[PDB]
Amino acid sequence: MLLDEGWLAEARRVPSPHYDCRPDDENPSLLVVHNISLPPGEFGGPWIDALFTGTIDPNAHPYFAGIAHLRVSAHCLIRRDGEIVQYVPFDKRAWHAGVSSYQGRERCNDFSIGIELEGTDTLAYTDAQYQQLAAVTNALITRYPAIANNMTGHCNIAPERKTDPGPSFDWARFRALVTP
Numbered sequence: 001m002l003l004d005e006g007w008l009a010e011a012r013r014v015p016s017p018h019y020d021c022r023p024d025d026e027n028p029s030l031l032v033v034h035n036i037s038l039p040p041g042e043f044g045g046p047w048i049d050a051l052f053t054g055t056i057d058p059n060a061h062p063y064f065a066g067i068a069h070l071r072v073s074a075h076c077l078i079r080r081d082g083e084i085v086q087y088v089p090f091d092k093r094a095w096h097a098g099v100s101s102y103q104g105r106e107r108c109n110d111f112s113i114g115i116e117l118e119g120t121d122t123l124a125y126t127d128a129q130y131q132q133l134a135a136v137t138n139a140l141i142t143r144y145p146a147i148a149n150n151m152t153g154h155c156n157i158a159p160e161r162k163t164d165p166g167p168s169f170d171w172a173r174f175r176a177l178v179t180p
């Protein structure tokens with residue numbers, strides 16, 4: 001669909017302080033699929049927005065105390081109902097992959113776009129999430145054709161550190177909706 005100076009035109013915008021420059025002004029070429037839920041296993045909170053913008057209340061839940069120290073973000077969140085929230089312009093570097101490697105290249109934040117699916121490793125994602133992830137990805141392919149050839153899970157670039165998006169992420173279903 002429509003892109004506007006790094007922003008998905010139809011996304012809900014929640015501009016986060018948590019981004020910086022892609023080194024060398026490099027165009028991203030890798031999509032990294034993640035999952036997230038705050039508190040763990042629970043859906044619907046304002047907590048993901050707060051985490052990715054650096055404003056989470058550490059006392060709001062026991063789990064938040066441990067992650068309040070994190071400086072993280074992602075380009076987009078796709079919620080259970082398909083709502084697309086964007087935090088970081090696609091041309092900028094969001095902080096979503098951490099220590100990672102892809103085809104021999106480290107620091108994957110540099111050249112990837114990170115999209116978060118609200119959910120868990122073992123629960124099915126919703127039809128709305130597959131459709132929306134596809135719409136976002138198709139829009140991305142249009143600007144950054146290399147992404148067609150480079151779609152991966154966080155678990156694939158950070159094995160034995162990360163498990164997201166887990167076995168529950170149906171790559172076949174996702175692929176069927178991409179590049180049409």
Ligand SMILES: [Zn+2]
Nearest residue numbers: 034035154164
């Ligand atoms: Zn992840």
